[PDB]
Amino acid sequence: RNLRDLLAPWVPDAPSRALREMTLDSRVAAAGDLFVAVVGHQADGRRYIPQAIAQGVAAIIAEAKDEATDGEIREMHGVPVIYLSQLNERLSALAGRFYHEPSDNLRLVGVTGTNGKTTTTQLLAQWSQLLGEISAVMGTVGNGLLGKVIPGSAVDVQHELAGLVDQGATFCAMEVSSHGLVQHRVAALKFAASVFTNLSRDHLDYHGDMEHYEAAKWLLYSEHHCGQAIINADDEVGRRWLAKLPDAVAVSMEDHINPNCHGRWLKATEVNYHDSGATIRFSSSWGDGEIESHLMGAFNVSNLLLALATLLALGYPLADLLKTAARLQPVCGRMEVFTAPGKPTVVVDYAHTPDALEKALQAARLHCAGKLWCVFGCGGDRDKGKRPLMGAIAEEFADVAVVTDDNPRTEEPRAIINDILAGMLDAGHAKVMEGRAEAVTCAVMQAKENDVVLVAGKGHEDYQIVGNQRLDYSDRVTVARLLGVIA
Numbered sequence: 001r002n003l004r005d006l007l008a009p010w011v012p013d014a015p016s017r018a019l020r021e022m023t024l025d026s027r028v029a030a031a032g033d034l035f036v037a038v039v040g041h042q043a044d045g046r047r048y049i050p051q052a053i054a055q056g057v058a059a060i061i062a063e064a065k066d067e068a069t070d071g072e073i074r075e076m077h078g079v080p081v082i083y084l085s086q087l088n089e090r091l092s093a094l095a096g097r098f099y100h101e102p103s104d105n106l107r108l109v110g111v112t113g114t115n116g117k118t119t120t121t122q123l124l125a126q127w128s129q130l131l132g133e134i135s136a137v138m139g140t141v142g143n144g145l146l147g148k149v150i151p152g153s154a155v156d157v158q159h160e161l162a163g164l165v166d167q168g169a170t171f172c173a174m175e176v177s178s179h180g181l182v183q184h185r186v187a188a189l190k191f192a193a194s195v196f197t198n199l200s201r202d203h204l205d206y207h208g209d210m211e212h213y214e215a216a217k218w219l220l221y222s223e224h225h226c227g228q229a230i231i232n233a234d235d236e237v238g239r240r241w242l243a244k245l246p247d248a249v250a251v252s253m254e255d256h257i258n259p260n261c262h263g264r265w266l267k268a269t270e271v272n273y274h275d276s277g278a279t280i281r282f283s284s285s286w287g288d289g290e291i292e293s294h295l296m297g298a299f300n301v302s303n304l305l306l307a308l309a310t311l312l313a314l315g316y317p318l319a320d321l322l323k324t325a326a327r328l329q330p331v332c333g334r335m336e337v338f339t340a341p342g343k344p345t346v347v348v349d350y351a352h353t354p355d356a357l358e359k360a361l362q363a364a365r366l367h368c369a370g371k372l373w374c375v376f377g378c379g380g381d382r383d384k385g386k387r388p389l390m391g392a393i394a395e396e397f398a399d400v401a402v403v404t405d406d407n408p409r410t411e412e413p414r415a416i417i418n419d420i421l422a423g424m425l426d427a428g429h430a431k432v433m434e435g436r437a438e439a440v441t442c443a444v445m446q447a448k449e450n451d452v453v454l455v456a457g458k459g460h461e462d463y464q465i466v467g468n469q470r471l472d473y474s475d476r477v478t479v480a481r482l483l484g485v486i487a
C-alpha cells in the first residue's frame, strides 16, 4: 500500500509513501497510517489533522471544501496532506482501491428493501455454498464466513469485504440499508446482482411526495454498479422499478409477471403450505420445477424465490439449485419450525412487537389445519405501550392465546400479564401460565397433532431475565426436548 498508487487515478502528482491502515478516526490513527479527514454531521475531521500528525500518520487525505482545490498536495510537519472535493462521495472508491477492490475478487450480491433482507441474504449465501462457493454474509446479525458470523462507514464496508476475501470467501450476500445507499457507503462496490424485496415506506401517498423520493433513488441507482437486477413483482414499487428496467428479472407468487415484455421471470404457480414447510411449484425462463422449502410463511416463499431467481440469473444451473433446495435452513429463531412424528407443529419466532407478532401468526396460520396457539409475553421494566396491542393481536389472529413471562426483570410478572389481557375483548378466554417453560409445555402438550403452536418473543435467545439474573433458558431447547428432537 502506497499513497502514490492509491491516488494515481485522481492525483498523478501524489508522493510515494508506504501506508499501513486507512482510518476515519484520528483517535485510533497509528504510525504509518492514512488518516482521512471528512466533513460529516456537525463534525470536521480536518480539525483533527494536527492530532493525527502528532500520532505519526504517514499521510492524510482531506475534504477540499473551502480550504483547497481538488487534488491540491500540501505538506505539514513532513506529512503530505492531499485535498479532494466531494470526499464523502468518493470514499467508497478510495477505500476500494486501498483494499485491492474486494468486490472484484468475489461475487457480491446486495439485497435491499424493508423486510426479508436477512433471510434472503442468508439463503443466497447458503445456496451458493451448497453449490461449491465459500460464502459470507454482511448484515444486521453480523459479518463473516457462513457459520462464523461475528457481531459503519464506506471504509469499514470495503475493509470488512477485504477481510472476507482474505479468509477465502468467493461469494458474499450483503444487506444494503436505504440509509447506507443515500450516504454512499456502497457507492464503488461492484455488485454481481441486486435484489429488491419490498417497500413499507409510508408518507409517500402524494404524487408530489412520491416523485422526489423516486427521483432521488433512480439517480443513485444510475450511479451504482448494480449488476443483474432481481425484483419482487408482487410489490407495487417493485413493478415501477421493473417497468423501466427491461433486463431485470421479475419474480412473483401472485400473478404479476407480464410475459409480454419477453424479459426474464420466475413465478410460483402453486404453493402448498404444510406442517413442516412449503411445497413450491414454479415456472421460469430457465425452466420449471418443484422445491421443498423448510421455511414457514408466504413472505419466505417470496424470499426463497428471489434467492433462486438471483442465482439462476448469475448462471448457477437450475438442476443443481433444485437438488440442494431441501438443505436450505431458516435463520435460527426466525419462523423456525420444529416437528416430530405425531406431535403438533411448533414454530419459534423472535416476534416481540405487535406488527411482528401479527405477521408471524398470519404466516403460521397458512400451515395450520387445526387450531393455532400463540405462547408469548412482554418484557418487564421496558415501555408498556405494546402490551395490550400484542394482547389484541394474539386474540384475533390465534385461536388460543397463552400469556406467560418474557424477561419480566424487576417488574411484577403478573402486572405485565394483566397489561396484556387488558388489551383483549375477552381476556377470560386467554390462558395464563406463569413460568415460561411451563407455559410452552402446556401449549405443546395440549395442542392436537395438526395444531400449530407459535412460541413468540425470544427466537434464538438463550436467557430469561428474572430479577437481576440471566437464567439459562431456551424456547428452542424447551420445544426440542418436549418433541424428542435436537435443537
Ligand SMILES: CCn1c(NCc2ccco2)nc2ccccc21
Pocket (backbone or CB within 6 Å): 110, 111, 112, 113, 176, 181, 191, 194, 195, 196, 217, 218, 220, 221, 222, 224, 226, 229, 230, 231, 241, 248
Ligand atoms: C444496491 C441496489 N439498489 C437497490 N435495491 C435492489 C434493486 C432495486 C432495483 C433492482 O434491484 N435500490 C437502490 C437504489 C439506489 C442505488 C442502488 C440500489
